[PDB]
Amino acid sequence: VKDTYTDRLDDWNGIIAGNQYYDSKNDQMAKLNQELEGKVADSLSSISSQADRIYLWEKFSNYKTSANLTATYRKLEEMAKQVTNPSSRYYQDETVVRTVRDSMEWMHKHVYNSEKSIVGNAADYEIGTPRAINNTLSLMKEYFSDEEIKKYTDVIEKFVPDPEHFRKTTDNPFKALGGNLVDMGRVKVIAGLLRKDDQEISSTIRSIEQVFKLVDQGEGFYQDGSYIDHTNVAYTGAYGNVLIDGLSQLLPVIQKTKNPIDKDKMQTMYHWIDKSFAPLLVNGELMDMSRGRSISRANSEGHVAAVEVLRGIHRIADMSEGETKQRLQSLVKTIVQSDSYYDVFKNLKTYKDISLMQSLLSDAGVASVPRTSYLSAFNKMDKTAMYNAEKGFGFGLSLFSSRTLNYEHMNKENKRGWYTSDGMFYLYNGDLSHYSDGYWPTVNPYKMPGTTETDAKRADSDTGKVLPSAFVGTSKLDDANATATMDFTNWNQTLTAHKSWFMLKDKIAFLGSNIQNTSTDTAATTIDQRKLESSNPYKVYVNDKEASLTEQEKDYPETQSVFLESSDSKKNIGYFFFKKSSISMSKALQKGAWKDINEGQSDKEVENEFLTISQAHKQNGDSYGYMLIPNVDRATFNQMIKELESSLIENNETLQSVYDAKQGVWGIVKYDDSVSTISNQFQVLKRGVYTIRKEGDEYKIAYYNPETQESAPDQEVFKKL
Numbered sequence: 001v002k003d004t005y006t007d008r009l010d011d012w013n014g015i016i017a018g019n020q021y022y023d024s025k026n027d028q029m030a031k032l033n034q035e036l037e038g039k040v041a042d043s044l045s046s047i048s049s050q051a052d053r054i055y056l057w058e059k060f061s062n063y064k065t066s067a068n069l070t071a072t073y074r075k076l077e078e079m080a081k082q083v084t085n086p087s088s089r090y091y092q093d094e095t096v097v098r099t100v101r102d103s104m105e106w107m108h109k110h111v112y113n114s115e116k117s118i119v120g121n122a123a124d125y126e127i128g129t130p131r132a133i134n135n136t137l138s139l140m141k142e143y144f145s146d147e148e149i150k151k152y153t154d155v156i157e158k159f160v161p162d163p164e165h166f167r168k169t170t171d172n173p174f175k176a177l178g179g180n181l182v183d184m185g186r187v188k189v190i191a192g193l194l195r196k197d198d199q200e201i202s203s204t205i206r207s208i209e210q211v212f213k214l215v216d217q218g219e220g221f222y223q224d225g226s227y228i229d230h231t232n233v234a235y236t237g238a239y240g241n242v243l244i245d246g247l248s249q250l251l252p253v254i255q256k257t258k259n260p261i262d263k264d265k266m267q268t269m270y271h272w273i274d275k276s277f278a279p280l281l282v283n284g285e286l287m288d289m290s291r292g293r294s295i296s297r298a299n300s301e302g303h304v305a306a307v308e309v310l311r312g313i314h315r316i317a318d319m320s321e322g323e324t325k326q327r328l329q330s331l332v333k334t335i336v337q338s339d340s341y342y343d344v345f346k347n348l349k350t351y352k353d354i355s356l357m358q359s360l361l362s363d364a365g366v367a368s369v370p371r372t373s374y375l376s377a378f379n380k381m382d383k384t385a386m387y388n389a390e391k392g393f394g395f396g397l398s399l400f401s402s403r404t405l406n407y408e409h410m411n412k413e414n415k416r417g418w419y420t421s422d423g424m425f426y427l428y429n430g431d432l433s434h435y436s437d438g439y440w441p442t443v444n445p446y447k448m449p450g451t452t453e454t455d456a457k458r459a460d461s462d463t464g465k466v467l468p469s470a471f472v473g474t475s476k477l478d479d480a481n482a483t484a485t486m487d488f489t490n491w492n493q494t495l496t497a498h499k500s501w502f503m504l505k506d507k508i509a510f511l512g513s514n515i516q517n518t519s520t521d522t523a524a525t526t527i528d529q530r531k532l533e534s535s536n537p538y539k540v541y542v543n544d545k546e547a548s549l550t551e552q553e554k555d556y557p558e559t560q561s562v563f564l565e566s567s568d569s570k571k572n573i574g575y576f577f578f579k580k581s582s583i584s585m586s587k588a589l590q591k592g593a594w595k596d597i598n599e600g601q602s603d604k605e606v607e608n609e610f611l612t613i614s615q616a617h618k619q620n621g622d623s624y625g626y627m628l629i630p631n632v633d634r635a636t637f638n639q640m641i642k643e644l645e646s647s648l649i650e651n652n653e654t655l656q657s658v659y660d661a662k663q664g665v666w667g668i669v670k671y672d673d674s675v676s677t678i679s680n681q682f683q684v685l686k687r688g689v690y691t692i693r694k695e696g697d698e699y700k701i702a703y704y705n706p707e708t709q710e711s712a713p714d715q716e717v718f719k720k721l
């Protein structure tokens, strides 16, 4: 029965499958179509036939694991996509139509109905499964009656009745904010159109609209671009991704309902793109520090994840006009063209997404210009992202605080994230593949780069923790220069450190003071654990003389510098030690499996070579002190460590400071309210974090107090001397 609800569903079909756009002459469309053909063949040759059965598919048979419900209905959706494609071999196929129908019925009667209770994880009963049912029904709505469609969605109503609340039938329910609110959207608007229910669509839209509100606490977007999910976790790059991905599919539909969404409540979406997501995207890669436990999935490494966000943006762009459309088209086009490592099309899963990207890349009117330098201090999620366009590298700093969880190990994913927010750093360089090709299952999780740690063994059954201290944050001065610190205590209160970082345009200084250990376990700071390419060997230098690294750890006492020299300048990494420091280094094959870190993953052995730089801390009160100088040739590094000979102002228990004389910039971290005179030019007065620039005879000042999460009047923290 055909009216405006089914007009809306025609539009949804065009978005989630886009059969209407399919063109067999299109190389990239034809390839995805081929992938759906083979997936439907596998389901059809596999499925349980004859006299009534205990499952539809054996690989997905234990209906107590709820991931098996969604995986089963997603196989039916795939059949509904091929069955409504004129160019599929399954086009209006009688077996396929009958199979989808009988399978919906069998599921309804035996596995997933209103008499059922949630067993296992609720996301499946409330989001994953309802989306696959709704999509199946929508694609194939000319093969079902109105009564069948109502019958097969009654269950969806029992599990998701309220527009406002996500878990309501359980012995334990919560509030829909964030991507779950947008996920509520996709479930209920579509179930609403399928069931010809105006109250369901309108109230569902009224409810989605709250996602446009910036928040002060809990889940959602903050004014500084942070995005929080699961109560206290940094999560732009997974739950954020869902939010933008899901909303951007639903909007063309919402905008033609009788309850359209105001074009001013919209403008918040562009602030998300520019403030929250864009800083997180480097050479086509979405930074791991923002993806939570999704880092532990072989099929969602950084460049694959990035595409979720990008296809979100390109849809937003398509529904905009004039200037905002061109700019967002250009943002997407430049990100995609910088990426020599990953073929975007491999994560573009509908014909209209393929089509949109194709037109975008070949439209000469759409500019593809290299992105400019920036620096985003996501204080509200204790992360900092930095990017230098001159030299070509990004930097991520992964922290946590009293306000945030260090790592998320949930649904048996990310078993060894332990130290991923312990002042872990990321370097984004000419090696696009670095954090990919099985970085995550192969990296030694005891030696996460930048982190100071004991060598105690860790247990995979462990969960995340908040930090005892609130004194964790970034003071940003400008697009090139900031300072961070972290009042560090380890997971069992045996070790501390005052860790601070000095972001100074084309280099970052790492200071640690007040290093203390009450355990018997040895303590060390990992300077680096860099994954290598057989195709691009580093020549390694210590104090400017060639060294040769071995599987076996070698000691390099009296070290002023280490330099890692590629044939490509954009892969080079220098480490300048302000004071001669006692270090060790090795280069070794490291093995493991994705399953080691995500139970639901493959157990196949993966391997990669890694080069590890560590500094032992054997005494209480110990210190570290070095400058990371990326993307310069050896001769340039040698000159810069001469410019910087005296850059270290202080590195003690109450005060840390570095000075860039070339820029005239100071970073400073104070742990107490004493008067600190700095370079004989000014004094700084309060506990907190400082980035300062001398312009002739004035000072620009960036003070941040991380505990109260406030800046301050200039006269309370700064005085010229």
Ligand SMILES: CC(=O)N[C@@H]1[C@@H](O[C@@H]2O[C@H](C(=O)O)[C@@H](O[C@@H]3O[C@H](CO)[C@@H](O)[C@H](O[C@@H]4O[C@H](C(=O)O)[C@@H](O[C@@H]5O[C@H](CO)[C@@H](O)[C@H](O[C@@H]6O[C@H](C(=O)O)[C@H](O)[C@H](O)[C@H]6O)[C@H]5NC(C)=O)[C@H](O)[C@H]4O)[C@H]3NC(C)=O)[C@H](O)[C@H]2O)[C@H](O)[C@@H](CO)O[C@H]1O
Pocket (backbone or CB within 6 Å): 015, 016, 017, 067, 070, 074, 077, 121, 122, 123, 128, 135, 174, 179, 180, 230, 231, 238, 239, 242, 245, 246, 294, 308, 348, 349, 350, 410, 411
């Ligand atoms: C333990 C406990 O009690 N915890 C609670 C806590 O509950 C937890 O909540 C979270 C949460 O969601 O917040 C739960 O998180 C999810 O867990 C599962 C299981 O491990 C993960 O698999 C899931 O990760 C997502 O999984 C999806 C999936 O496969 O189901 C992924 O799906 C795909 O997403 C695409 C993005 O739009 C989508 O396009 C795609 O569909 C296809 O799209 C096409 C298209 O391009 O249009 C196409 O045409 C197609 O037709 C269409 O099918 C969709 N499906 C496929 C097959 O590709 C998704 O990308 C992936 O991210 C994970 N969710 C996230 C966001 O990570 C957790 O399990 C719960 O336990 C409570 O929340 C908390 C209170 O707040 O308290 C805790 O105690």
